[PDB]
Write an enzyme that holds these catalytic residues in place. Structure first.
Site, PDB file in Angstrom:
ATOM      1  N   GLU A   1      49.726  49.814  49.708  1.00 48.21           N
ATOM      2  CA  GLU A   1      48.533  49.123  49.421  1.00 48.21           C
ATOM      3  C   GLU A   1      47.366  50.041  49.143  1.00 48.21           C
ATOM      4  OE1 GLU A   1      48.483  45.690  49.226  1.00 48.21           O
ATOM      5  OE2 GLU A   1      50.325  45.035  49.826  1.00 48.21           O
TER       6      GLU A   1
ATOM      7  N   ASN B   1      39.644  41.281  42.278  1.00 41.34           N
ATOM      8  CA  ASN B   1      40.654  40.536  41.548  1.00 41.34           C
ATOM      9  C   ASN B   1      40.035  39.745  40.517  1.00 41.34           C
ATOM     10  OD1 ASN B   1      43.186  41.420  43.232  1.00 41.34           O
ATOM     11  ND2 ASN B   1      41.676  40.352  44.914  1.00 41.34           N
TER      12      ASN B   1
ATOM     13  N   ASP C   1      40.707  35.382  40.223  1.00 35.14           N
ATOM     14  CA  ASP C   1      40.306  34.463  41.558  1.00 35.14           C
ATOM     15  C   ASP C   1      39.056  35.002  41.860  1.00 35.14           C
ATOM     16  OD1 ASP C   1      42.037  36.613  42.866  1.00 35.14           O
ATOM     17  OD2 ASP C   1      41.036  35.412  44.236  1.00 35.14           O
TER      18      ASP C   1
ATOM     19  N   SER D   1      38.337  37.712  43.911  1.00 32.18           N
ATOM     20  CA  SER D   1      38.254  38.085  45.170  1.00 32.18           C
ATOM     21  C   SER D   1      38.443  39.625  45.422  1.00 32.18           C
ATOM     22  CB  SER D   1      39.639  37.334  46.136  1.00 32.18           C
ATOM     23  OG  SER D   1      40.770  38.020  45.211  1.00 32.18           O
TER      24      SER D   1
ATOM     25  N   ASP E   1      40.117  43.012  47.736  1.00 31.42           N
ATOM     26  CA  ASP E   1      41.240  43.359  48.781  1.00 31.42           C
ATOM     27  C   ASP E   1      40.459  44.850  49.581  1.00 31.42           C
ATOM     28  OD1 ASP E   1      43.369  41.471  47.974  1.00 31.42           O
ATOM     29  OD2 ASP E   1      43.160  42.576  46.045  1.00 31.42           O
TER      30      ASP E   1
ATOM     31  N   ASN F   1      42.214  40.741  51.945  1.00 39.46           N
ATOM     32  CA  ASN F   1      41.587  39.889  51.012  1.00 39.46           C
ATOM     33  C   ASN F   1      40.370  39.085  51.522  1.00 39.46           C
ATOM     34  OD1 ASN F   1      41.667  37.073  49.077  1.00 39.46           O
ATOM     35  ND2 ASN F   1      41.882  39.011  47.916  1.00 39.46           N
TER      36      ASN F   1
END
Length: 130
Positions: free
Chosen positions: A35, A46, A49, A51, A53, A60
């Site tokens: 990750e 992102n 959408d 968003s 992380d 998120n």
């Protein structure tokens, strides 16, 4: 803070992650490895959408922490996403445990499915003495 493998593995062990929700430390290493590569600063936008992380576990901002910018998101009564970018990972760990109590468990992170599911994840905790 960019962690060392064994230091992290010992750190998570201290935080009670081993066997948590049926999830070994080896799997927590695998997840964090893929990750963020073990980097607390790690931030991934992102665009689709819209968003983000955050941190070592790439949490998120739509579902578990709030940055205010995320469309369709959790209220500013929650945990701030900034808390997930600190050198100390206790809060990220706290939120991590939360995320996985939901039924899908560890399958929550698509990266874990791609890279960690049904495989020998021992190399991650190899020789860390935990």
């Amino acid at each position: 803070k960019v962690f060392e493998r064994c230091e992290l593995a010992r750190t998570l062990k201290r935080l009670g992650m081993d066997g948590y929700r049926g999830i070994s430390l080896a799997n927590w290493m695998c997840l964090a490895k893929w990750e963020s590569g073990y980097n607390t600063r790690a931030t991934n936008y992102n665009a689709g959408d819209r968003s983000t992380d955050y941190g070592i576990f790439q949490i998120n901002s739509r579902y578990w922490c709030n940055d205010g910018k995320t469309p369709g998101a959790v209220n500013a009564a929650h945990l701030s996403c900034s808390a997930l970018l600190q050198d100390n990972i206790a809060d990220a760990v706290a939120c991590a445990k939360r995320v996985v109590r939901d039924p899908q468990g560890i399958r929550a992170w698509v990266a874990w499915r791609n890279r960690c599911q049904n495989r020998d994840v021992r190399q991650y905790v190899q020789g860390c003495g935990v």
